[PDB]
């Protein structure tokens, strides 16, 4: 009975077109409920109103009043009288203020959702003598009902103004504190498009919340993962806020040292390209290329190269020239600035087949059953991608190729490294230079020839140093030299022949291309 | 296609290659026209087509450079005629999966209506003349009731197909929006001409009882369509959904007020409605739940077994799954209604 009249009145405001019915609705609302005058009302509603206690009727009718007020204030441009408040609008506002001051959680949530974006439209000077009390409702809104606000935050489709107001209010509230659901709501907010202002608000709230208890591990279910993803999104969105985000990231790593790297590795594959790469551009700042930056690079780069090589055909072939150029700049920046990480990733096929292993490898480098085939395949795909993206001949170093004659990796992996380099030199000889290369290119070719000669010289002076009942076991060893079955090969002529294949490709490059 | 078994990515290749290396439009899409004709013949219940082959043909037409949509455009009316009828699934069963087929057909239909709505709404008027034409004099004729229920079912399937296409391919700059947003107001009227006439002429058959489920499924599908349109864009979609609900809420309230015993069944649909939005987490759901709750709370005194429990429980990505579940429910209900009406 009551709902019939309520919906009949509300339909005027709920229309998608503008008409001349809302004035009558406002007058009826102010004359019937607030002022207690049932004139012009039918007997059914007249009996129903007196049937229930008045405050229950007010609670039931409040959502309609809130909806009408929100719709009328949100369409100030549509009605066209933006200079002041409409008479029907003023009456509706006064009725709403009377009902508020003079299942409740659902109504509170509805009010918060409706008036979070529509709070700035109401000004402190817009309230006349009649709306004097409304200050006590609107003045706190220019800054627990915050539970309802937080519940309204978890909405995939909310206007930017209301979300910004909610974030501002929660930042203000947590400023004076100095729930995890607050973090969840902010993260869900950041899953959509983010403006610079709300990005700064999010950075401030996350740097403030670190003072509050958030995964204390000085020893998205975990709050640390949510905070890390939020910080990554903030950095990718991005003056001094860069420094603030970096300090927050350092603190977050200090909290969960082990979890930090795992979260980075997961994020490498979670988001697609043009996002991890843009995040790395924001972090490293390698556009103008020459503590935790190295940690993040070490955690990310291996998986990033793996994912880039997995989709190499769909990366440089299409019109992703900007993305591919950014990836190449990132790889060159890591090679010239981080070193050890890049060398580990390039020589992954040797490291993933045998932490302390890398240190032993570099100590030997400075000195100068079956094998894990999958690790070697992955490392060789990574190495192929790296030599495709890096400058021709820079990868790998001549010292690396010299030491690969006598290293601790399986012989098959080292020969695969040699053969990958050999086929790269061969393709460079054919004119099949890397696609990005195909005046600057002339310098690249010249430097490639010089670096190939560097490889040749190093491998040559290493091979020169290397060169300078028993029958039963000899036959036994000779008859089962299965290279995929290690410990029957390394513990050397085949490796020297793979190196000689690299030198042969170098020589056939120098005798034809460089001479011309 | 008809008697044997083939594979896609070859039929599409053959049709596209025939579209190339030819001059006259007569021989440009000869293979495409043949494929469309074969699919139509299968939908006309004349030839034994394997269900996998039917799905392959529908996917081939959906993928269309093979000029398949051009040949479909001539018989989109026939496609709508096939989709509207309720016995088509049962008759095709003579030769579970069928609902999928319907959705696929809906997609292409929506796609065609997507192309035909550019400042003129030619496809909307031509293919669906009754969309802007509510029942004459707003009468409750049983034949008018059946026709309007069928039209609402057709609209629900069209919206389901459009939503499925949008979910599968949201990267398109132009969303598949066959029904205009303003036109929804008109469709609101149609829904009420099912709900207003329900108490008098619902006991003549079981299909009239399933028309309750059909109407509420269409209502929730339209709500989700408006929500998706607003998310992709803004004010127009939410305002149209608001007007639709403000038009159909007095209808459902008076439907409850008619008979105080059958409300239970109706209540089911109503709570099911919010359940759908509970699965969809729509903005309009949060907007309208503070007023939808008293509708059942005031009727909690008339709930038989566990509807009060459901109201208490609901008192306090997945879109594709919800769309598929709704499609399966619609197909199953249509098949059951055809089985019951065959008596």
Coordinates of C-alpha atoms in Angstrom, one line a residue, chain A residues 187 190-191 220 222-235 249 252 263-264 267 270-271:
Chain A
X187 CA 43.3 -2.2 -3.8
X190 CA 43.2 0.8 -7.8
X191 CA 42.2 -2.2 -10.0
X220 CA 46.0 -11.6 -2.0
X222 CA 48.5 -11.9 2.9
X223 CA 48.4 -8.1 3.4
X224 CA 52.0 -7.8 2.3
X225 CA 51.2 -9.1 -1.2
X226 CA 48.3 -6.6 -1.5
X227 CA 50.5 -3.7 -0.4
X228 CA 53.2 -4.7 -2.8
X229 CA 50.8 -5.0 -5.7
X230 CA 49.3 -1.6 -4.8
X231 CA 52.8 0.0 -4.6
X232 CA 53.7 -1.5 -8.0
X233 CA 50.5 -0.1 -9.5
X234 CA 51.3 3.3 -8.0
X235 CA 54.8 3.3 -9.4
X249 CA 59.0 -0.2 -1.2
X252 CA 58.0 -3.3 2.6
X263 CA 55.7 -11.5 -5.2
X264 CA 57.8 -9.8 -7.9
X267 CA 53.7 -10.2 -10.9
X270 CA 50.4 -11.9 -13.8
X271 CA 50.2 -8.7 -15.8

